[PDB]
Ligand binder design. Structure first.
Ligand SMILES: OC[C@H]1O[C@@H](O[C@H]2[C@H](O)[C@@H](O)[C@@H](O)O[C@@H]2CO)[C@H](O)[C@@H](O)[C@@H]1O
Ligand SMILES: OC[C@H]1O[C@@H](O)[C@H](O)[C@@H](O)[C@@H]1O
Length: 257
């Protein structure tokens, strides 16, 4: 059992999987009130009731991303012990991720439930820059739109609550300090169970970036981590009340030459 009540990172092991939990309030300059994240051996929960919020950089828009992850998160130069990641995108035959989730929030709060990875040129960078990519997969959103511009839609399968469905995913692309690609499910789900293969998203991002002038040799990039969390806030938001619970977590990364 692990508990955190202030920003920071803690490692844990869940169902034999080495993971990292991060009570991530990366773009908040100051806050008052309470935040708590806990892992009890069977579930990870997060609860926030914070006020007196101000951002560090208004330009970034969101305020934080409480989350847990498998692998090496570049920004925090951090990995738990025993992860197979990072590996070259080309080394990933399949990467199945499964998790149950229940997200709740005050109605007007901009928020999402999104997963993400950082594809980088070198294996252990401490930042992302031109030539690198951030790929996100949004299963839910409230009062929040991905950054960049919507450039297309893809039909990508996934198992929703036990049933194979064909989801419709909007691809938003932003060319910032690195490339940002966000795939947003058009039928957002606030609570449920999902199982999917990250390889499908990597294949779709690879095609969308095939003609890029900033990103080259996509398959040679290092898939560093797989983050699961909830971004929240906006430059104007002065308070936030929300929380979540994730359970039934398993992942399977299949490595090939
Ligand atoms: O910019 C460095 C911080 O990035 C945070 O991840 C953001 C990312 O920057 C956004 O482009 C988008 O992908 O959402 C992510 C989560 O809000 C990262 O979590 C921080 O640790 C970094 O300092
Ligand atoms: O930091 C930039 C932010 O831009 C927003 O428009 C997106 O909704 C977030 O996914 C992203 O984190």
């Amino acid at each position: 059992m692990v508990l955190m009540t202030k920003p920071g990172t803690s490692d844990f092991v869940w169902n034999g999987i080495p993971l990292s939990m991060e009570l991530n309030l990366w773009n908040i300059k100051e806050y008052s009130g309470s935040v708590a994240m806990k892992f009890d051996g069977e579930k990870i929960t997060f609860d926030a009731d914070i006020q007196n919020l101000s951002p560090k950089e208004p330009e970034r828009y969101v305020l934080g991303y409480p989350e847990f992850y498998y692998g090496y998160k570049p920004w925090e130069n951090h990995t738990a012990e025993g992860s197979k990641l990072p590996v070259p995108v080309s080394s990933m035959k399949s990467f199945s991720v499964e998790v149950s989730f229940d997200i709740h929030h005050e109605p007007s709060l901009p928020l999402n439930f999104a997963m993400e990875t950082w594809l980088t040129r070198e294996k252990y960078q401490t930042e992302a820059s031109i030539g690198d990519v951030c790929i996100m997969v949004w299963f839910y959103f409230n009062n929040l739109t991905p950054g960049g511009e919507k450039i297309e839609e893809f039909t990508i399968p996934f198992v929703l609550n036990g049933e194979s469905v064909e989801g419709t995913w909007e691809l938003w692309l932003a060319e910032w300090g690195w490339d940002y690609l966000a795939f947003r499910l058009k039928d957002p789900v606030k609570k449920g169970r999902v199982k999917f293969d990250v390889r499908h998203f990597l294949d779709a991002a690879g095609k969308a970036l095939s003609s890029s002038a900033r990103v080259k040799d996509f398959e040679d990039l290092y898939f560093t981590v797989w983050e699961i969390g909830t971004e929240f806030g906006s430059p104007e938001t002065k308070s936030a009340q929300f929380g979540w619970k994730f359970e039934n977590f398993s992942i399977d990364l299949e490595v090939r030459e």
